[PDB]
């Protein structure tokens, strides 16, 4: 089970960093004012999907914490939550 | 100055993720014995360097917080500490 939590955590690290990248692209986009509707909607789309992946990873970590209850499942839950939060920020930054 | 903290933050996100990639490689290698002495010493060297980079970004964040106790500078210091900590885990894993 600790190996399942390790794959959950590492997958969360991936979606966090990718949300971090998308958020930066969206923040630079609002400050630049580049109203490339294709680019604005593409970032919005990939940020929305990244969030749904983060929510799925989140609830899967909750399930892996119902069972067991170890620190490795606990850390995998925080990393999923952070990824969810970074994705919601990339979301709201893409709306503008 | 708030743009400087954004750059110090984004740089800390890169160092964090790279420490996450290095650490996973070292744990996977410590678990098995596949790591050659070249590779084991290579992961350690880039992790040690990555650690020093994370200490420099941390201290630069402590300076930025000293100059202005802004929330943007605060989160950048948190991200640098996180990168520092992830780098140190990559160090200890590469020792084995």
Numbering used by the authors:
A (entry chain A), B (entry chain B): 2 to 97
Report text from the authors:
We set out to design proteins that can switch between two well-defined and fully structured conformations. We reasoned that these goals could be collectively achieved with a “hinge”-like design in which two rigid domains move relative to each other while remaining individually folded. The hinge amplifies small local structural and chemical changes to achieve large global changes while the chemical environment for most residues remains similar throughout the conformational change, avoiding the need for global unfolding. Designing one of the resulting conformations to bind to a target effector couples the conformational equilibrium with target binding.
To explore whether peptide-responsive hinges could be turned into protein-responsive hinges, we used inpainting with RoseTTAFold to add two additional helices to a validated effector peptide, resulting in fully structured 3-helix bundles (3hb). For nine of our validated hinges we designed and experimentally characterized these effector proteins using SEC. Hinge-3hb binding was tested qualitatively by SEC and, for hinges which had a corresponding FRET construct, quantitatively with the FRET-labeled variant, and DEER was used in addition to FRET to confirm that 3hb binding caused the same conformational change as effector peptide binding. For two designs, 3hb05 and 3hb12, we obtained crystal structures that agreed well with the design models, indicating that the three-helix bundles are fully structured in isolation. The 3hb approach was able to rescue designs for which the peptide alone or the hinge-peptide complex had shown the tendency to form higher-order oligomers.
